[PDB]
């Protein structure tokens, strides 16, 4: 029959495809890296086309390599990099511009007019968001103010707007379906999370043809089908969608209130489930939409960090300093400290809870006797520091201090990081065996919508902490070590020039 | 309806190209698969990874260019020539991994045949030679190695197959089990004359005919694939050729006496000998090629096990380079090799030596010999080897090239190229498009279905990018050549069997 | 006796040159030695190492050119300006490593000196300024550091020295215990007017004057060494000077209004004021230089801590270069820095900032920033700093430089070389020999023993290999520098006092 | 006077060592000098750089340890063995570079000798083999190689000297033109029974007797030196041994049957034949050693041209290793060489082959062979190589060695050591101070001046910092050795005799 479920994981640097069974086991994984584009220092674009091709070709790769047929597939699950924005010709199916990645700082000016006009409170109250270039909203308008006759064609409904989810599905369903999810929508900055519907002022204000928005839907649900050839008569129902950090909250089973995870991908993402109730932050955090225990709408507090595993990949690729992302640890463990150095990975602004799109990355505390290692290690340490940073925003908004931090992601593998991570917070860190929880979540979500599993409790014992790390460092020390960060942090601030 | 796709299963990677009616390369994807070396002298590949990579590629090149399944007239297939796969018909799983054309394991087996005087027959009927390179020994070997296989094989539960064969099967979801003359004539299980399986041979090696695929023309609609898309959207597989043979065809070397040289993982020189199967006294092979129609033709062939693969050895194993075109970079940092010689016999010798017992060697090292000399020499083995066979080639053939037309990946190295000429004393023409191997498979597949009416349609298509002319006097060339022979002798018969 | 030998004791290595009467280099030796960073922001060397290196290079230049001890008319001497040694005259064993001029350890001391109101004196009696750059504190530091030191100090059991001193002492086996002016000018313990140690200062720092050597003139037979060879065989030491001052001299920037920049371990722009001891307004120093005969003169100095060492750091420490010539290679792989700024305050600031709490920093990183961008930014940091001093220079100097005399290893960098022109919006003159810091000392030694008659002979050697000229727009220039200034401000006072 | 200084002029660096009454090392200097290879097979050095570096080191190690001339009881000297220098007596300027012992360049000259029935005579009187290794051929070479040398040399004009000779004479300004037994021995220009220059040889090689220095005893005050310092301070030079014999002696291998192996640029195995000279019917060198008092003694020698030099090659030329000690690291990542063998005949053969025409080579290359297998194979040769001499030696000696007392810097490599053990199926004895060469030269000099009165004094000096026991089956041990032998044989006679 249909014994398998597939999760497409559209990430910021690579596209992935995973394959599970009823037991919730990965049978297969494929992954293809795509290119980053920086046409101006501060900007990041992606080829929607390249987003497509990779995802597709990976989908195939996982099956084909497994000797798995279109028919054994119960359903498709879709997770994606949260905020990147594409817009294309409804006819051609052709994008009228590159995708603008969630990290681009190009709409800073625009954010500025928002600011000026006094939309902060509304936006904050209505969206859970903050005005930063981080969001879809500003980006849309841009491509719009950029492409010559675009607004017209847009109203005339000739142009389409989409998040990565929306783009994958549509290409997937030949153009048939044009939908999006709750989790996704909530990041667009054009969507009212109370109303649960678009937001007129917001559209208004941004000036964006309503004609172009997809349609929000539940996270767990059937939206279409796909024909990926095979035998004929076979169609695969696509029935699960979630902005990736949320999928990862779900995949961790943080379905109840006060439940939180840390995710270490390109960036770092921490989120707490705030239940049926939506908390407003005072600590530089974002209110957003997560998944109830049934795919139903829940609310979350979330703290976003622009640079986590990307920093490492900068060291490898750009800096050519490690010649294996795990070399990182190798190098970093070759020193007992950083010799006073600090790295500030504000490559794409600050973001949280600082929210400083003018901040650029930086190195501090340089002395003649500082070596690469010290730099590598500092770079690692920077991840941890950022975490503590949000982790604190949290307790402050919530009044709870985690007992242990549950994490996940690719970098979690780095035991140096994990340990350090523990040392700095003064908390226990628990590492599972499966750190691809994001794709689990999408699987999970999609499976539900079609029988696959019938309830969360099915999955309740699948997830297991492969490892728990505990702090082996002095408060005093921890504190101290945190003190310089903060100081470095501020110095990173406002580098960039806003006229 | 607007494009044509070629599938190109390389020893090292699976690639897929998109071409239009005017023969343009619209798009390309390339995907790498692991080489497994169970034991030194052995080479395996995984059939599955092969399937995966190749599948993933096809999808990617289309998805990439925003091409719909529905806009593809046909799909052509070219593949690495000798690699053998044996899987269960029933469940579509391999009983063992693909044993590569390079694998030297069947050496013992070859010994037997020799003794049994099989040599004449083999040579005479298959045009081959008794070498571990051909698929024949490989099947048996797997058979011998697989317990109670023969049986099921006999009672037909297992299929035998070369790449094409495995590809197409996977793509017709088991519907068609085919092969073509080019490939068929590489297994050592087929009569190049009687155009069909040789019984003596089938007997001799003991292989149940039950497992052999159907042999067909290289240009003909053999079936359809369903890659998804608009529904009732199905694509015809109408072209099939062994890479070298495809390469040969994509160069429009469809007339008697026309030859090419391909620089790939190894090097394969081929000459079209028209309607006549010319027998090689000189160490070369007689084989099945394509006539201007996809009709059977014969060819003289020189096979050279290592070429560009040496370069990747340096890069990945030896770690000596930062890239393979970085090769030209270091090689030109030096003017000679300081006496150094490289005998890239990582997998036996090959034409015209045929010594599966030869192994890689470097000679004439002195205290001041550095890497560049070493890199430069790797390049030269490439040029040396070619001359060898070429020599064999004019003898046998009777022809005397006024130039050697080339292609393959390595052709971009101008160092290699320039050196090639000089060592040969012949001009060398390097075409604009070095990928003539997918083109051939395209042109085959396309002829099949009315994409192009004829070969003459793609002739004004060819375009020489560069002609390299020799910059040396015989004295040099022979000397350098001299040194070359000496080495060779030194590299043969390293491994033991006794 | 046909050759002259210059001893060159740098912050990184010890060198040794041989010059014929023609003022041609015949040969040279080098020997690197270890930098010790006992602690971030601390820098030290081993007095023996300096010694050792300096010896064997000396034996090697000779030996390798088949030149005999008896052909050598004199020994010139130059050295790294402020590093401090104090040993036991008894045994000749140092009581503590050398405290390198770069070292920041005596920032506390400098602080109380500021508290206690001494700025105005120092700046006035030394023309120095209050930084750990100078010996004064280093001395004090050690004294206070080492147990009953001040005793013996006063007993006459311990000796103090600057490198030239340490050298000359070892060479004469303890017989001579001298130093020149230029060097003395840097201790912050010596009155650039009264031309002699300053009691005030001695007193202010607690330094027995009985550990101090004799201040002498730059060109002057101070003594002789014995290096073996044809018995009775003896060599006179007749030249002494701070590298910088030595460079300045070797460059024949002898008349007032003369300035060169040198590019080594750090950067040092010096302008000859002649007998006029001008007082700095702009953050520069006022020291003692030499006129045409070794006689005293004054100078304005722009002193930059990091320059070639920055590049070294990339090679050896960051391992971003395989060869410090590759430096250009990389830098030129790009067209600009991609918005990056590097601030080489590895060992504090320097002129004209004077910030011992500043620490190296890098700014404006974006994902598309790579190593080349950075290597290039290191180099640019060098060209920047300099405009800074230049600026202050013309400030305090009142004169506007039309061209810049340049020298030292780092100048072989055409890139660096060209960037700098551009950025200054000034021409740049680059000589045929950048070993001018060794020329300098030879010269001085040579004059002393009459190897050479007058400068005028020298002159015709000064040949300009090349000259650069500003490629960028008067605007770019201001826009790049601008970036520079801000980065700077962010590096200041990173260190917690 | 509390110290002694050994000068150790090696093939690739020049060191200088300070020791006391307890013979404790107290300080060290080391300065590398350039290798020069005008042409593949040739090695020259620059008398000047060697001088230049040897001085500096000597001075560097004293100035640094704060030691003045006045504390130096004496100076010993050890040196690279056969490298020849010829220079104008007048000027002290050489008429050519030093021809290193590894240089092959007189190959032909050797050819004539052989062709003239000289083998026996030479072996019989010199204890040597006709090979380009020795001084003899190198002088004529120089002599013929320069227009009017012969003459002047006769007319007084020119001096000839090896490395010991050439240092003392610069160190003494022209005063002493001395050499030692050990040194003389290897010129193949000196009679080992007769203890003097061999008249015929000179005749033969046509060398004016006027250019030779005086032979002296290994431990004896040849003279004095002025390194400056505090007035009327001369230091005495009372010891000279070739590094090998200096290691032998330094080893305390004072009695017959006592042997050691040194691992440095080359590898030298030496057995003390006591007072008598054993003749080699097995390819070893019969040579002059030192008795417990620095007197004439005889020895057997196994000379291996490349060993540690091999590693320098990998590091600076091949580039492959980060620090010459990275070898072990790398070598220990593979548990074997995948069938590879390195035959380090960079400068020809050497005992027990004496193949000047051989060059280095790599056998058994397979696709999956990486740098590591090559690096480890590079080490194993070292070991193989010892086994080669080791056995000759037992055959020649009539002695089955029980343990192998080694020394040299490479001895620092555990791998090498266990390995060595394994393939020997012998226990290896690793000392605690690896500077034995310098110790040997110190003792000699210190003996000569009563710094010590005898060896006994130091019998309890020298320690076994470690013992290595084999851990490998005959079979396989025999097995790998076997691979080695084929490899060797395949390297032989690579180069061509004109």
Swiss-Prot record, chain A:
Which residues are involved in binding ADP?
Answer: 12, 16, 266, 309, 410, 414
Result when mutating residue 473 to D:
It decreases Vmax to about 10% of the wild-type value and the affinity for substrate is increased about two- to fourfold. This mutation decreases the catalytic activity in a manner that is analogous to that obtained upon EIIA-Glc binding
Could you tell me how activity relates to pH for this protein? Answer: Optimum pH is 9.8.
Q: Name one GO biological process term.
A: glycerol catabolic process
Look up the record and report any one GO term of the cellular component aspect.
cytosol
Regulation of activity is described as: Activity of this regulatory enzyme is affected by several metabolites. The non-competitive allosteric inhibition by fructose 1,6-bisphosphate (FBP) causes alterations in the quaternary structure of the enzyme. FBP inhibition requires that the enzyme exists only in a tetrameric state. Salt such as KCl reduces the affinity of the tetrameric form of the enzyme for FBP. Unphosphorylated phosphocarrier protein EIIA-Glc (III-Glc), an integral component of the bacterial phosphotransferase (PTS) system, also inhibits non-competitively and allosterically the activity.
Q: What induces it?
A: By L-alpha-glycerol 3-phosphate.
Molecular function GO labels: ATP binding; glycerol kinase activity; identical protein binding; metal ion binding; zinc ion binding
N6-malonyllysine-modified residues are 231
According to the UniProt record, what happens if one changes residue 303 to S?
In glpK22; abolishes glucose control of glycerol utilization
Return the Gene3D superfamilies for the record.
3.30.420.40
| Residues that coordinate or bind beta-D-fructose 1,6-bisphosphate | 233, 235
Q: Which residues bind Zn(2+)?
A: 477
The record's keywords, sorted A to Z, are: Allosteric enzyme, ATP-binding, Glycerol metabolism, Kinase, Metal-binding, Nucleotide-binding, Transferase, Zinc
Q: Which residues bind glycerol?
A: 82-83, 134, 244-245
The answer, when asked if Kinase is one of the entry's keywords, is yes
Q: Which reaction does it catalyse?
A: glycerol + ATP = sn-glycerol 3-phosphate + ADP + H(+)
In which pathway does this enzyme or protein participate?
Answer: Polyol metabolism; glycerol degradation via glycerol kinase pathway; sn-glycerol 3-phosphate from glycerol: step 1/1
Residue sites binding ATP per the record? 12-14, 266, 309, 313, 410
**Assembly behavior:** Homotetramer and homodimer (in equilibrium). Heterodimer with EIIA-Glc (crr). Binds 1 zinc ion per glycerol kinase EIIA-Glc dimer. The zinc ion is important for dimerization.
Protein function: Key enzyme in the regulation of glycerol uptake and metabolism. Catalyzes the phosphorylation of glycerol to yield sn-glycerol 3-phosphate. It also catalyzes the phosphorylation of dihydroxyacetone, L-glyceraldehyde and D-glyceraldehyde. It uses only ATP.
Protein name, entry field: Glycerol kinase
**Lineage in the entry?**
Bacteria, Pseudomonadati, Pseudomonadota, Gammaproteobacteria, Enterobacterales
């Amino acid at each position: 029959e249909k014994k398998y479920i597939v999760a497409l994981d559209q990430g910021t640097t690579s596209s992935r495809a995973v394959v599970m069974d009823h037991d919730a086991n990965i049978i297969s994984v494929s992954q293809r890296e795509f290119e980053q584009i920086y046409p101006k220092p501060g900007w990041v674009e992606h080829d929607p086309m390249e987003i497509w091709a990779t995802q597709s070709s990976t989908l195939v790769e996982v099956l084909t390599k497994a000797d798995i047929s279109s028919d054994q597939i119960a359903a498709i699950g879709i997770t994606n990099q949260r905020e990147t924005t594409i817009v294309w010709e409804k006819e051609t199916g052709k994008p009228i511009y590159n995708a603008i990645v969630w990290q681009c700082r190009r709409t800073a000016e625009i954010c500025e007019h928002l600011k000026r006009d006094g939309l902060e409170d509304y936006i904050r109250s209505n969206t859970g968001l903050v005005i930063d270039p981080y969001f879809s909203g500003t980006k849309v308008k841009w491509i719009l103010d950029h492409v010559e006759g675009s607004r017209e064609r847009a109203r005339r409904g000739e142009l389409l707007f989409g998040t990565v989810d929306t783009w994958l599905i549509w290409k997937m369903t030949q153009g048939r379906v044009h939908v999006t999810d709750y989790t996704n929508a909530s990041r667009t900055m054009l969507f009212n999370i109370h109303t649960l519907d678009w937001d007129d002022k917001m559209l208004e204000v941004l000036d964006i043809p309503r004609e172009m928005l997809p349609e929000v839907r539940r996270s767990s649900e059937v939206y279409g089908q796909t024909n990926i050839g095979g035998k004929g008569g076979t169609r695969i129902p696509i029935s699960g969608i979630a902005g990736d950090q949320q999928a990862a909250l779900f995949g961790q089973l943080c379905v109840k209130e006060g439940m939180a995870k840390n995710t270490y991908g390109t960036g770092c993402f921490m989120l707490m489930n705030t239940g049926e109730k939506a908390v407003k932050s005072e600590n530089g955090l974002l209110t957003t939409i997560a998944c109830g225990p049934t795919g139903e709408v829940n609310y979350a507090l979330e703290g976003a960090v622009f640079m986590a595993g990307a920093s490492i990949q900068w060291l490898r690729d750009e800096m050519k300093l490690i010649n294996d992302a795990y070399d990182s640890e190798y190098f970093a463990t070759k020193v007992q400290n950083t010799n006073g150095v600090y790295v500030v990975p504000a490559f794409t602004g600050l973001g949280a809870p600082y929210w400083d799109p003018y901040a650029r990355g930086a190195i501090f505390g340089l002395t003649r006797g500082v070596n690469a290692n010290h730099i590598i290690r500092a770079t690692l340490e920077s991840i941890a520091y950022q975490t503590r940073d949000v982790l604190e925003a949290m307790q402050a908004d919530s009044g709870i201090r985690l007992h242990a931090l549950r994490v996940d992601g690719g970098a979690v593998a780095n035991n140096f990081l994990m340990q350090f991570q523990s040392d700095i917070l003064g908390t226990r860190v628990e590492r599972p065996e499966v750190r691809e929880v994001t794709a689990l979540g999408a699987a999970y979500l999609a499976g539900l919508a079609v029988g696959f599993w019938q309830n969360l409790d099915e999955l309740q014992e699948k997830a297991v902490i492969e490892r728990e790390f505990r702090p082996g460092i002095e408060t005093t020390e921890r504190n101290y070590r945190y003190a310089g960060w903060k100081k470095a942090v501020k110095r990173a601030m406002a580098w960039e020039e806003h006229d």
